[PDB]
Amino acid sequence: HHVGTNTGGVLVITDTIIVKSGQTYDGKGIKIIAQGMGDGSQSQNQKPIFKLEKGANLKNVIIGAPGCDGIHCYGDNVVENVVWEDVGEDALTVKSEGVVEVIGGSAKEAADAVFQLNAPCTFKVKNFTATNIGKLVRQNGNTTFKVVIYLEDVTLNNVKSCVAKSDSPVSELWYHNLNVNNCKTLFEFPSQSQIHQY
Ligand SMILES: O=C(O)[C@H]1O[C@H](O[C@@H]2[C@H](O)[C@@H](O)[C@@H](O[C@@H]3[C@H](O)[C@H](O)[C@@H](O)O[C@@H]3C(=O)O)O[C@@H]2C(=O)O)[C@H](O)[C@@H](O)[C@H]1O
Ligand SMILES: [Ca+2]
Ligand SMILES: [Ca+2]
Ligand SMILES: [Ca+2]
Ligand SMILES: [Ca+2]
């Protein structure tokens, strides 16, 4: 394990970091604290820490409290080895269509959702831990577009509401090596047959 060369540094930011199409922001283990961008509460008006335009990637950053509005993904994004020490309003939001993969890393202390899906997408969570959360994945309430969610090698502890929630009959969730402790209910979808193993 080579921890990154920015390990031990803290970057204090005052505006959202924009990562452009085709670019990869590699924090090399930096911890980010955001100023003036939100308090990590359930207020709906906070700014994202990162905006990942379509085709942008992000890796190897710790996001400290306050989590603000987390990471906004505009599709075709890889988010790798990102640690949310204290999720804000939500951890990551899919804002526009495409494939979005969260690989490695962890999240803790999400009062509500970790991952928020606001557009049709393929959303994969791989090699990920989360503790003390409301929901791991929420498709935006009362929407009926299609998402396909994959949970692969995911460990969850202390899930207050459910692992995943959708109000869309056409959406699907597929899981493989999902371990869950102390969770109220696993899946809140119109029908349980929308959930599959692989
Ligand atoms: O992207 C966002 O931050 C969205 O936040 C709000 O929507 C979420 C969610 O999609 C809604 O269904 C609703 O969720 C319920 C409740 O308000 C709360 O989230 C919790 O008790 O869970 C409920 C549920 O999941 O059914 O509100 C959510 C919220 O974060 O408050 C916005 O209303 C959206 O327009 C997005 O901005
Ligand atoms: Ca919200
Ligand atoms: Ca949000
Ligand atoms: Ca929190
Ligand atoms: Ca919320």
Automatic annotation (TrEMBL):
Binding site for alpha-D-galacturonate 1: K108, Q116, N118, K135, R138, G141, K165
Binding site for Ca(2+) 4: D86, V87, E109
Compartments reported by the entry: Secreted
Residues that bind Ca(2+) 1: Q42, Q44, E89, D112
Residues at which Ca(2+) 2 binds: Q44, D69, E89, D90
Amino acids binding beta-D-galacturonate 2: K135, R138
Binding site for Ca(2+) 3: D69, D90
Chain positions recorded as beta-D-galacturonate 1 binding sites: K108, K135, R138, K165
Residues bound to alpha-D-galacturonate 2: K108, Q116, N118, N140, G141
Assigned protein family: Belongs to the polysaccharide lyase 3 family.
Listed name of the protein: pectate lyase
Natural source organism: Caldicellulosiruptor bescii (strain ATCC BAA-1888 / DSM 6725 / KCTC 15123 / Z-1320) (Anaerocellum thermophilum)
Lineage, highest ranks first: Bacteria, Bacillati, Bacillota, Bacillota incertae sedis, Caldicellulosiruptorales
Residues of the full protein shown: 268 to 460 of 460
